[PDB]
Design a protein around this motif. Structure first.
Motif, short mmCIF file in Angstrom:
data_model
loop_
_atom_site.label_atom_id
_atom_site.label_comp_id
_atom_site.label_asym_id
_atom_site.label_seq_id
_atom_site.Cartn_x
_atom_site.Cartn_y
_atom_site.Cartn_z
N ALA A 55 0.80 -1.22 0.00
CA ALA A 55 0.00 0.00 0.00
C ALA A 55 0.84 1.27 0.00
N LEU A 75 -7.90 -10.12 2.52
CA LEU A 75 -8.88 -9.40 3.33
C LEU A 75 -10.07 -10.28 3.71
N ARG A 78 -9.11 -13.06 6.23
CA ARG A 78 -8.90 -12.51 7.57
C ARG A 78 -10.20 -12.37 8.36
N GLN B 38 -2.05 0.58 6.27
CA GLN B 38 -1.76 0.40 4.87
C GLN B 38 -0.37 0.94 4.58
N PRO C 21 -3.22 9.41 -1.52
CA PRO C 21 -3.03 7.97 -1.30
C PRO C 21 -4.33 7.17 -1.27
N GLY C 22 -5.49 7.84 -1.34
CA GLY C 22 -6.76 7.13 -1.31
C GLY C 22 -6.86 5.98 -2.28
N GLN C 24 -4.65 3.74 -2.74
CA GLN C 24 -3.99 2.61 -2.09
C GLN C 24 -4.81 1.94 -1.00
N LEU C 25 -5.89 2.55 -0.54
CA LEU C 25 -6.75 1.94 0.46
C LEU C 25 -7.76 1.00 -0.19
N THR C 26 -8.16 -0.01 0.56
CA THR C 26 -9.18 -0.94 0.09
C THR C 26 -10.55 -0.29 0.27
N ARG C 28 -13.43 -1.73 -0.22
CA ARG C 28 -14.46 -2.68 0.16
C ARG C 28 -15.01 -2.30 1.53
N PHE C 30 -12.67 -3.30 4.94
CA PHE C 30 -11.84 -4.14 5.78
C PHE C 30 -12.30 -4.07 7.23
#
Ligand SMILES: [Zn+2]
Lengths: 140, 51, 32
Positions: A55, A75, A78, B38, C21-22, C24-26, C28, C30
């Motif tokens: 990331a 994900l 987990r 992250q 950087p948004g 690079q975040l998931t 979904r 988490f």
């Protein structure tokens, strides 16, 4: 099974006149449950270190989708392990409360050898199988 | 400003019951938790200006 | 590296830093 391997525990062996649920047996499943719990805790903890490195590095527009694909598999899993740990913790409460080894629907007792494979089992094969059947009908 | 039940709590409370500096600290850490999980470094400075 | 200067439009540059950087975040949901 690598589950039985993680702990230094060996499959139990009910002896001729051994009483049902005794001290030695609950000590047996406690080691397995804590070790299984300790292993799961390490999987959620490790995974993240790799997750934090990917990331931080920005992929090329072309490999964002390929990189993301591997992230999604991790994900989802987990959250299942978190459920598994919560199920183990729930099962760990059954040992302390002295209510381990019996079917939750009917009072029938669950097998000893059956519990060594999946110590978190809550029902007997009859009630469990019937439940899965109701599921496919009540769901779809 | 004590926990009278559990579960996540609304930021609307934290400001009111615990203080302007309390709620600001709740946000900055809970947002950075997602970024820092992250591996992304965003100095608190910025998140504060949003706050 | 020196201190922020009078007039610099820090609100914008703050916003940008968070939003870049948004990617690079998931997105979904988490659940740790
Ligand atoms: Zn049953």
């Amino acid at each position: 099974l690598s589950i039985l391997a993680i702990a230094g525990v060996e499959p139990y062996q009910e002896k001729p006149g051994e009483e049902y649920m005794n001290e030695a047996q609950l000590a047996h499943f406690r080691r397995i449950l804590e070790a299984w719990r300790n292993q799961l805790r390490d999987e959620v903890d490790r995974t993240v270190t790799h997750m934090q490195d990917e990331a931080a590095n920005f992929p090329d527009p072309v490999d964002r989708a390929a990189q993301e694909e591997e992230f999604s598999l991790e994900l989802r899993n987990r959250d299942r392990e978190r459920k598994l740990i919560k199920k183990i913790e729930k099962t760990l409460k059954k040992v302390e409360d002295e209510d381990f080894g019996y079917c939750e629907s009917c009072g029938v007792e669950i097998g000893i050898r059956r519990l060594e494979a999946r110590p978190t089992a809550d029902l007997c094969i009859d009630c469990k199988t019937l439940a899965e059947i109701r599921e496919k009908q009540m769901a779809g | 400003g004590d926990v009278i039940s559990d579960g996540p709590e609304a930021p609307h409370d934290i400001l009111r019951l615990r203080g302007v500096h309390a709620v600001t600290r709740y946000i900055v850490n809970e947002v950075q938790d997602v970024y820092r999980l992250q591996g992304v470094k965003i100095n608190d400075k910025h998140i504060e200006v949003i706050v | 590296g020196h201190i922020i200067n009078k007039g610099e439009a820090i609100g914008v540059i703050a916003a940008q830093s968070i939003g870049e950087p948004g990617t690079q975040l998931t997105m979904r949901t988490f659940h740790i």
